[PDB]
Amino acid sequence: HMTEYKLVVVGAGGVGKSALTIQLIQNHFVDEYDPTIEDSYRKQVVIDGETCLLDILDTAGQEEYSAMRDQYMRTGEGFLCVFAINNTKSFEDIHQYREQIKRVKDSDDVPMVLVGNKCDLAARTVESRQAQDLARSYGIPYIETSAKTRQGVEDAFYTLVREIRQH
Template sequence: MCPAANQAARQGVRRRSGGAESGAVHEPTVRKLATSLRDVAQFLREYKLVVVGGGGVGKSALTIQFIQSHFVDEYDPTIVHSYRKQCMIDEEVALLDVLDTAGQEEYSAMREQYMRTGEGFLLVYSITSRNSFDEISTFHQQILRVKDKDYFPVVVVANKADLEHERQVGTHEGQALAKHFGCPFIETSAKQRMNVDEAFHNLVREIRRYNKEQAAGRPGAAAATKPAQFQEEQTQSAGCCTGCVIL
């Protein structure tokens, strides 16, 4: 074989060897990446959210609409149901553990038990029920007493906004109550999926803000710095929230 042919053959062998080596490196890289992703999943920040409110205000409908993206029409009094969902909130992944609690008075002691472990609370009332609105202050006081805090992350949620013709509680009343609590306010419709995702996402934002204030050594600062934009940013959201995964 001529020298030129020998050189070409050697180059071909080197090229084939290089290709084989590249393929050998590729598989371990994939395995390493998969392992890294599993490790990240194990260390996702989990948020324990508790949905609180009187009977029949739509707590379960709101929760199921958020978790499963469908509306539950029939009313079946809940004792307690737990749901999990992974979401991207403000470019940060969050694993939400949502507890849907009973609104009936006979379950008050059980509700306190779940309040002890909750990191944030949706205080839900129906715009069609003055009584459910009046109960919100009682639930809020109960949370502060159980937590032994002057402030704790909550969001006031006025549900059933689609039933405007049956409204008994004005929007300004809900806003005033939320301002008194030092927390965000939002009107929702579980039936129309209006502001459902935002209600839960806003609560996660409140928890993050509260934790940052605590870490900075300013335990009372969170209550004095509630952002007003939550009351203004009540855009209707249809369909499932972007980047959410049911677990």
Template sequence: KFVQEYKLVVMGGGGVDKSSPVIQLIQSHFVDEYDPAIEDSYRKQCVVDDEVALLDVLDTAGQEEYSAMRDQYIKTGEGFMLVYSITSRQSFEEIFTFQQQILKIKDKDYFPMVVVGNHCTRESERRVTSQEGQSLVRQFGCRFVEADCKTRENVEYAFFELIREMRDYEE
């Protein structure tokens, strides 16, 4: 039986733990220490809504400053996970820039993406409200998930929402 493959790109500003959701999904454990300078690619097979999906996940890990590389992985990506930390307003404000870059390079008004507010269990440090996240994705026309990699809360769900977004886009 044919297995659909999905090329996902995880993007976000420096220091938002973008790599953690990826490692959580792939290896099912939380990694406290990782080297954010290394771009990495992971593959995982999973079942989303009774259909098998092979995820090919490129973790851009804070390499956004190399614009030629960024353009290249945006060109090849089929779906994008834009990650910010709910404890960092700056990381939230950068999400709009990533979205604009993706649409410009893809030359589209819409492209499959999901916005993820990471660290959702760190409520006392929150600098970005859930409502602000919801409001942003309404502008983008995409899905929004608040997740926390340490507790695994909504990590798999965030990836599955992106797959659903990509499937809707293909139809």
């Protein structure tokens, strides 16, 4: 049996956080997505030579069901904490998400990555140095991704798997 990594995407709604996972799963030259099937949230990958399966939970659209976060978070081994580089409130919310993951997993050391997502051509309000300083204060990696080009997407997820393997 190959290793299966249960990953959870968390972050503010309304800022295109869903693009991260959709871009990962859908083939690099395919744009036809159906979220109502198994293959839409599962992907077999080779990372550092070791083949594995990534099971990704993204509840984008369910942000108002705030009392269901703990339930959703407890399913994960690793977390992608996503904010939009054009939405400072989504960046400021990260601290709350991380603290909630730590409370749910009952651990101060939970495999986690910070992801700054460039979700449109609106102006950047969060400088890479701000996010790099925040990620450093938490002791975690920071990865920036582009929703249009797929740049950084694989690096974000693969870095998280490495964070789990090196836990």
